[PDB]
Design a protein around this motif. Structure first.
Motif, PDB file in Angstrom:
ATOM      1  N   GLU A   1      -9.323 -11.905  -6.977  1.00 15.60           N
ATOM      2  CA  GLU A   1      -8.666 -10.727  -7.531  1.00 15.60           C
ATOM      3  C   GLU A   1      -8.929 -10.592  -9.024  1.00 15.60           C
ATOM      4  OE1 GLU A   1      -7.092  -8.231  -6.187  1.00 15.60           O
ATOM      5  OE2 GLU A   1      -6.558  -7.329  -8.115  1.00 15.60           O
TER       6      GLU A   1
ATOM      7  N   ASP B   1      -7.186   2.018 -10.531  1.00 19.30           N
ATOM      8  CA  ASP B   1      -6.715   1.190  -9.426  1.00 19.30           C
ATOM      9  C   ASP B   1      -5.282   0.726  -9.652  1.00 19.30           C
ATOM     10  OD1 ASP B   1      -8.687   1.222  -7.510  1.00 19.30           O
ATOM     11  OD2 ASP B   1      -9.802  -0.456  -8.381  1.00 19.30           O
TER      12      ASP B   1
ATOM     13  N   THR C   1     -12.408  -9.398  -9.441  1.00 17.95           N
ATOM     14  CA  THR C   1     -12.485  -7.985  -9.092  1.00 17.95           C
ATOM     15  C   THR C   1     -11.982  -7.115 -10.233  1.00 17.95           C
ATOM     16  OG1 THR C   1     -12.052  -8.647  -6.809  1.00 17.95           O
ATOM     17  CG2 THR C   1     -11.943  -6.308  -7.325  1.00 17.95           C
TER      18      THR C   1
ATOM     19  N   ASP D   1     -22.245  -4.192  -4.556  1.00 16.69           N
ATOM     20  CA  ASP D   1     -21.513  -2.937  -4.507  1.00 16.69           C
ATOM     21  C   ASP D   1     -22.176  -1.892  -5.396  1.00 16.69           C
ATOM     22  OD1 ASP D   1     -19.628  -1.074  -3.854  1.00 16.69           O
ATOM     23  OD2 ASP D   1     -18.021  -1.933  -5.078  1.00 16.69           O
TER      24      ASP D   1
ATOM     25  N   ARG E   1      -4.197  -3.890  -2.885  1.00 11.61           N
ATOM     26  CA  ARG E   1      -4.725  -3.837  -1.531  1.00 11.61           C
ATOM     27  C   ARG E   1      -6.105  -3.193  -1.517  1.00 11.61           C
ATOM     28  NH1 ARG E   1      -1.863   0.183   0.040  1.00 11.61           N
ATOM     29  NH2 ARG E   1      -0.913   0.476  -2.022  1.00 11.61           N
ATOM     30  N   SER E   2      -6.952  -3.669  -0.603  1.00 14.87           N
ATOM     31  CA  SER E   2      -8.337  -3.214  -0.559  1.00 14.87           C
ATOM     32  C   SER E   2      -8.440  -1.727  -0.251  1.00 14.87           C
ATOM     33  CB  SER E   2      -9.119  -4.022   0.476  1.00 14.87           C
ATOM     34  OG  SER E   2      -8.861  -5.408   0.339  1.00 14.87           O
ATOM     35  N   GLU E   3      -7.482  -1.184   0.502  1.00 11.46           N
ATOM     36  CA  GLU E   3      -7.537   0.233   0.841  1.00 11.46           C
ATOM     37  C   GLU E   3      -7.440   1.098  -0.406  1.00 11.46           C
ATOM     38  OE1 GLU E   3      -5.362  -1.771   2.700  1.00 11.46           O
ATOM     39  OE2 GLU E   3      -3.302  -1.254   2.144  1.00 11.46           O
TER      40      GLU E   3
ATOM     41  N   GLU F   1      -1.963  -8.346  -6.439  1.00 14.04           N
ATOM     42  CA  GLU F   1      -3.242  -8.280  -5.739  1.00 14.04           C
ATOM     43  C   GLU F   1      -3.324  -6.917  -5.063  1.00 14.04           C
ATOM     44  OE1 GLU F   1      -4.645 -11.770  -3.932  1.00 14.04           O
ATOM     45  OE2 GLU F   1      -2.884 -12.985  -4.421  1.00 14.04           O
TER      46      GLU F   1
ATOM     47  N   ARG G   1      -8.579   0.346  -3.412  1.00 12.45           N
ATOM     48  CA  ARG G   1      -9.873   0.325  -4.084  1.00 12.45           C
ATOM     49  C   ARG G   1     -10.902   1.165  -3.339  1.00 12.45           C
ATOM     50  NH1 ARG G   1      -8.850  -3.420  -8.115  1.00 12.45           N
ATOM     51  NH2 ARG G   1      -7.834  -5.342  -7.404  1.00 12.45           N
ATOM     52  N   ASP G   2     -10.919   1.085  -2.006  1.00 17.74           N
ATOM     53  CA  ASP G   2     -11.860   1.899  -1.241  1.00 17.74           C
ATOM     54  C   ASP G   2     -11.589   3.387  -1.429  1.00 17.74           C
ATOM     55  OD1 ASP G   2     -12.529  -0.634  -0.442  1.00 17.74           O
ATOM     56  OD2 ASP G   2     -11.656  -0.447   1.563  1.00 17.74           O
TER      57      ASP G   2
END
Ligand SMILES: Nc1ncnc2c1ncn2[C@@H]1O[C@H](COP(=O)(O)OP(=O)(O)O)[C@@H](O)[C@H]1O
Ligand SMILES: [Mg+2]
Lengths: 50, 443
Positions: free
Chosen positions: B99, B229, B102, B299, B250-252, B248, B254-255
């Motif tokens: 994290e 974000d 990221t 990425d 959530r990945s959703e 942290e 960021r997507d």
């Protein structure tokens, strides 16, 4: 003669209508509290002489 | 807000129009191959097309790798993000290593959204606010003037409240943003009629503005991808931008942010300006961090990562086997390595002279020669640190120049690593050894 009478009547009616529309607009523009005391703050440039 | 620091003397990479490094320009000396490679990476960043490249800077200590990074950052200038982190910074307690990496990666991508705003600017003539006591109705008009035009505006409630809060007067030149609604007091046009309090606090007059009263101006909002974000992660994420404690994300989130920003770019609303991420002493990172770096470089929204290492062959942290640069072969396979070399006597001398110029220390020729010989003998950084102490010693002597004797005194008072090691070995009983034994008494 009768048509002249009707025409002056129509002219008076039209003038009355237009003036009343203007007066209604002015009354709309004058929307404020009725007969209440008001506190006013004013700032203005003042000219000075010796 | 800055002071004279170690790398304060370099303002760029010092390159020509054909990326040929000058012998000495913008603070950098020598390192011609390294400077040419850094310029190539600079052009790659400025192009904005190549994504997720990794570049390594290797070489002995004091060879100018961090100086090279600072030169790249200075050539980039503002408006191009530069994230300088150390390997120790990743290991946190509130966030995972992945994290933190990221967030560091996303800190290097900037999003610019340009907006056009209408601004009213002028010198006030008359302000008049009429409010009824024990009543909520307020009515006011103002006359704001410019050199070529003058007009009167009848004000709504919020504008009246804003002007009352801002304490606007007649002799005030102010700006009004019709969208935001903020009032900025630029200055004064004349004095306040000679009242008792605040007699002469308005002497700094400002000129009356000129031109159209209501003019359009453009405003650019630059925000990094990580900030977006954090804002969209939770409702309290805006506070997390300053406090930390982002959690942290959530990945959703960021997507979805990635998709939305891509849509913004395709729509012309936003301009993406990718930057550079710089990791000091990457050998401190764990193998998990290196694996994540391996994957995250693929990425499309990734910056260009540059790392500094001087360990040579060393044990990768988290594993029990030695690796060529302290890094696993997987990360070395996808990184281009630029190397640095030791400095000549002349390069050391001119670096010392540059530092003396930056520290405002006037060195005599003999003093500079002695410092260069000392630096070749012991260390470049040792002589760099000795310069300022020699200046202070000279000041104690009431002299405006540093001579050989001042440098000699500084050398005598302050030691190098080798001399300290020698003094420790000669007097080992006076220091605590690795086995926890020491002699305190002298008899
Ligand atoms: N090529 C160079 N040009 C100008 N100054 C340099 C150069 N190389 C090193 N220096 C100076 O010497 C010092 C070396 O610091 P640093 O770059 O951190 O060493 P390292 O390369 O071991 O990290 C810096 O303060 C820098 O100002
Ligand atoms: Mg360094």
């Amino acid at each position: 003669k009768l048509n002249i009478l009707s025409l002056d009547k129509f002219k008076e009616q039209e003038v009355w209508k237009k003036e009343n529309r203007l007066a209604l607009q002015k009354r709309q523009k004058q929307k404020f509290q009725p007969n209440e005391t008001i506190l006013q703050f004013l700032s203005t440039a003042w000219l000075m002489t010796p | 807000l800055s002071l004279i620091a170690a790398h304060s003397h370099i303002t760029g990479l010092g390159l020509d129009e054909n990326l040929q490094p000058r012998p000495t320009s913008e603070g950098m000396v020598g390192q011609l191959q390294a400077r040419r490679a850094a310029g190539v990476i600079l052009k790659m960043v400025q192009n904005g097309t190549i994504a997720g490249r990794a570049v390594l800077v290797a070489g002995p200590p004091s060879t100018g790798k961090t100086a090279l990074a600072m030169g790249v950052s200075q050539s980039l200038g503002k408006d191009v993000p530069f994230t300088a982190i150390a390997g120790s910074e990743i290991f946190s307690l509130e966030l995972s290593k992945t994290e933190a990496l990221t967030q560091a990666f996303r800190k290097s991508i900037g999003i610019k959204i340009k907006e056009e705003t209408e601004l009213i600017e002028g010198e006030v003539v008359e302000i008049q606010i009429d409010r009824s006591i024990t009543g909520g109705h307020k009515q006011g008009k103002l006359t704001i003037k410019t050199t070529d035009m003058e007009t009167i505006y009848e004000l709504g409630n919020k504008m009246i409240d804003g002007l009352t809060k801002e304490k606007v007067l007649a002799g005030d030149v102010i700006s009004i943003d019709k969208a935001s609604g903020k009032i900025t007091k630029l200055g004064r046009s004349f004095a306040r009629s000679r009242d008792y309090d605040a007699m002469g606090a308005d002497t700094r007059f400002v000129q009356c503005p000129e031109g159209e009263l209501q003019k359009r101006k453009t405003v650019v909002h630059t925000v990094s991808l990580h900030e977006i974000d954090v804002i969209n992660s939770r409702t309290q994420g805006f506070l997390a931008l300053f406090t930390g404690d982002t959690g942290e994300i959530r990945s959703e989130v960021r997507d979805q942010i990635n998709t939305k920003v891509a849509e913004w770019k395709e729509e012309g609303k936003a301009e993406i300006v990718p930057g550079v991420l710089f990791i000091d002493e990457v050998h401190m990172l764990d193998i998990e961090c290196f694996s994540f770096i391996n994957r995250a470089l693929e990425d499309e929204f990734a910056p260009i990562v540059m790392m500094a290492t001087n360990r040579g062959v060393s044990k990768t942290r988290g594993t029990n086997y030695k690796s060529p640069h302290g890094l696993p072969l997987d990360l070395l396979d996808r990184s281009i390595i630029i190397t640095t070399k030791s400095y000549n006597e002349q390069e050391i001398k001119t670096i010392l002279s540059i530092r003396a110029q930056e520290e405002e220390v006037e060195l005599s020729s003999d003093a500079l020669d002695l410092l260069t010989k000392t630096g070749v003998e012991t260390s470049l950084r040792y002589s760099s640190n000795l310069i300022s102490v020699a200046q202070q010693i000279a000041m104690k002597r009431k002299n405006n120049t540093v001579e050989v004797e001042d440098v000699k005194r500084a050398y005598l008072l302050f030691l190098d690593s080798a001399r300290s090691v020698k003094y420790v070995q000669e007097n080992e009983s006076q220091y605590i050894d690795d086995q926890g034994n020491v002699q305190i008494s002298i008899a």
